[PDB]
């Protein structure tokens, strides 16, 4: 309905994307009887976590 060169005419659905940043950390990983990761503990997350 509106020309291609203009910003208008390129309508799409509402989608939100997340971006995080990785910082070096030491994480304990818990496997399960079948061999899949279920729970993790981050040391810096809490004194309890430490």
């Amino acid at each position: 309905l509106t020309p291609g060169d203009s910003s208008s005419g390129w309508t799409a659905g509402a989608a939100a994307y997340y971006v995080g940043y990785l910082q070096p950390r030491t994480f304990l990983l818990k496997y399960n009887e079948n061999g899949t990761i279920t729970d993790a503990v981050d040391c810096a997350l809490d004194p309890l976590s430490e």
């Epitope: 309905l1 020309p3 291609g4 060169d5 203009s6």
Partner: nanobody
Framework: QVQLVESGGGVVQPGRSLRLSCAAS????????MHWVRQAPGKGLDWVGV????????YYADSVKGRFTISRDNSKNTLYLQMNSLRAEDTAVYYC??????????????????????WGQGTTVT
């Protein structure tokens, strides 16, 4: 910032040859249908022709026949037009204009015509 540059103006000896060319800033020159509009000194606007994205289909107005040829050079970013003769039509100002109707727009079943968005600086043809 979109700008189309006219060239090949000036008064020459009347007849048999005259060179016009229209440049285009940026890299969006190709794939956009382009038309040439001639401005009469006191009789309003008129048409010259039209060329598509690849130049397979070309059409000309009824005002002039057999004297105009339109071609586009993709690498040089300049469109070229030639007049094989110079008739009594003098002091006509020629503009080059870009129309956003791309190949995909007429590829889709939709039948739509947009508007001549950006125009050139203009030139003098005598």
């Amino acid at each position: 910032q979109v700008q189309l540059v006219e060239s090949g103006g000036g008064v020459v000896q009347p007849g048999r040859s005259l060179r016009l060319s229209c440049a285009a800033s940026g890299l969006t020159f190709s794939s956009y249908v382009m038309h040439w509009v001639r401005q009469a000194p006191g009789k309003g606007l008129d048409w010259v022709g039209v060329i598509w994205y690849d130049g397979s289909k070309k059409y000309y107005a009824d005002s002039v026949k057999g004297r105009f040829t339109i071609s586009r050079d993709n690498s040089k970013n300049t469109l070229y037009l030639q007049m094989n003769s110079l008739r009594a039509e003098d002091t006509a100002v020629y503009y080059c204009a870009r129309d956003p109707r791309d190949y995909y727009d007429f590829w889709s079943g939709y039948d739509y015509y947009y508007g001549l968005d950006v125009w050139g600086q203009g030139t003098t043809v005598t």
